[PDB]
Amino acid sequence: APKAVLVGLPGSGKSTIGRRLAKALGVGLLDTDVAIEQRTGRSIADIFATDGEQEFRRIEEDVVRAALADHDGVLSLGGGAVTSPGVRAALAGHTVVYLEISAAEGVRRTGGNTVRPLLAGPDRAEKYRALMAKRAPLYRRVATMRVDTNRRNPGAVVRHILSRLQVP
Ligand SMILES: Nc1ncnc2c1ncn2[C@@H]1O[C@H](COP(=O)(O)OP(=O)(O)CP(=O)(O)O)[C@@H](O)[C@H]1O
Ligand SMILES: O=C(O)C1=C[C@@H](O)[C@@H](O)[C@H](O)C1
Secondary structure, three states, X not given: OOOEXXXXXXXXXXXXXXXXXXXXXXXXXXXXXXXXXXXXXOOHHHHHHOOOHHHHHHHHHHHHHHHHHHOOOEEEOOHHHHHOHHHHHHOOOOOEEEEEOOHHHHHHOOOOOOOOOOOOXXXXXXXXXXXXXXXXXXXXXXXXXXXXXXXXXXXXXXXXXXXXXXXX
């Protein structure tokens, strides 16, 4: 059982924070997007382009359920992880930290050049607003703790988290 599951829109910090939240607790971090690229031997960019999100979402669903019982440290979920009705029920009972972010910073932190299937230019922001709107509800449903990583220092966020994870 993960010491904490991290969910949030791509660009919310899931990785930056998943590392500091894991290194501070003394437990390895784990990414579902990365776990899938291993169990399949295929890049998520391909699995999407060739087989499709439909099938991908299934594979992710199976991989997540797999980590919710195997991993003992910090677990990080892919953006649309919470769109899978099955994934949301596997999260029931876990410590789920929803890292919130506004369309402003979210898009500013994702304008790099990593191949994001669901977030590709042009109008890469309209796409972000949509993802945010459509999913925001979902993240609330599975989140046992809502932390804002918007205006904050990657470390000051982990600071905030650990306190609320030790206090009732
Ligand atoms: N709490 C925070 N405050 C300030 N900037 C932060 C932040 N957390 C992360 N960032 C910045 O946001 C950028 C993207 O962060 P991150 O890589 O964690 O996205 P992500 O893991 O949510 C996306 P994906 O789901 O695609 O893997 C980095 O440049 C990072 O420095
Ligand atoms: O927003 C999403 O649903 C995604 C986020 C990434 O982590 C990858 O899992 C993939 O690009 C899909």
